[PDB]
C-alpha cells in the first residue's frame, strides 16, 4: 500500500522526442550526439517493458499535438507513462525545431482531469535540455 | 474522494534551473549516459528515486567538461529531480 500498483497488462507507453536539427532562425545549432542518446534510451526503456516510440526533429506544434493525442489514448491497462525530451531549452521552456514551447503545456495534457486513464498512475518526464546559461565551475 | 490534478508527476531534469546541460557529440549527453547506465544495472530492482539519486551522483562525480574555449572548460553539472509522486515506483512485478 506504499507502492504504485504495477499489475497491469502492460508497463506502458514511452514517447521519445529526439530533436537534432533546428530552423536557423531559432539561433540553435545541430545537437550532435543526440542520436546516440535516443538509441540508448530506446534500448533501455524497451528492456524495462515500455512500448517505445521515437519522434525526430519535431516542430512545437507536432510536440504539443503528439502528447495531446497520447493523453487521449486509453491507458486503462498500463501501469504508467513515460516521456523523454531531448532538445535545446531555456528556463521553463523547450525547443521545437521552429521555436520554444513551455514545459508546463507539454505535461499539462496528462493532468488528472485531462487524462482520466492515467489517474493515480505515475507520469514520468525525463528532460535533457539547457535551462539557462549559467555554468557550474565546481569546487574542491 | 478527490485527487489533485497535478499529483503523480515526476520530472527528471538533466540540470538545475538557470544552468546549461552538457552533451558530448561523440558519446551523447552526460545525463543520458548516466541514466541508461544505472537503468541497465538497476532498473528492475531499485525504486525510481534511488535510481535518479544514483544518476545525480554519477553525473556529479564522473563528468567534467573539456573545451578549447576556456569559458566552457572544466565545468560541472548536477541533475534535478522534481517529484509529485504519492507512492514508491518499481518497474517490476
Amino acid at each position: 500500500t506504499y507502492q504504485y500498483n504495477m499489475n497491469f497488462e502492460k508497463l506502458g507507453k514511452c514517447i521519445i522526442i529526439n530533436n537534432k536539427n533546428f530552423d536557423k532562425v531559432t539561433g540553435m545549432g545541430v545537437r550532435n550526439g543526440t542520436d546516440k542518446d535516443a538509441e540508448a534510451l530506446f534500448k533501455c526503456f524497451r528492456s524495462l517493458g515500455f512500448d517505445v516510440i521515437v519522434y525526430n526533429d519535431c516542430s512545437c506544434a507536432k510536440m504539443q499535438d503528439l502528447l495531446k493525442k497520447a493523453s487521449e489514448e486509453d491507458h486503462t491497462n498500463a501501469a504508467c507513462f513515460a516521456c523523454i525530451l531531448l532538445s535545446h531549452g531555456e528556463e521553463n521552456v523547450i525547443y521545437g525545431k521552429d521555436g520554444v514551447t513551455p514545459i508546463k503545456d507539454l505535461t499539462a495534457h496528462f493532468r488528472g482531469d485531462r487524462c482520466k486513464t492515467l489517474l493515480e498512475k505515475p507520469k514520468l518526464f525525463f528532460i535533457q535540455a539547457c535551462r539557462g546559461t549559467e555554468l557550474d565551475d565546481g569546487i574542491q | 474522494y478527490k485527487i489533485p490534478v497535478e499529483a503523480d508527476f515526476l520530472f527528471a531534469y538533466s540540470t538545475v534551473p538557470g544552468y546549461v546541460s552538457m552533451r558530448s557529440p561523440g558519446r551523447g549527453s552526460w545525463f543520458v549516459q548516466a541514466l541508461c547506465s544505472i537503468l541497465e544495472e538497476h532498473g528492475k530492482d531499485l525504486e525510481i528515486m534511488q535510481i535518479l539519486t544514483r544518476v545525480n551522483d554519477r553525473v556529479a562525480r564522473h563528468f567534467e567538461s573539456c573545451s578549447d574555449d576556456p569559458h566552457f572548460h572544466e565545468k560541472k553539472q548536477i541533475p534535478c529531480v522534481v517529484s509529485m509522486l504519492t507512492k514508491e515506483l518499481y518497474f517490476s512485478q
Binding site: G89, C130 | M22, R23, S24
Partner: peptide
C-alpha cells in the same frame, strides 16, 4: 563538449 557542447551545451544544450
Amino acid at each position: 563538449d557542447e551545451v544544450d
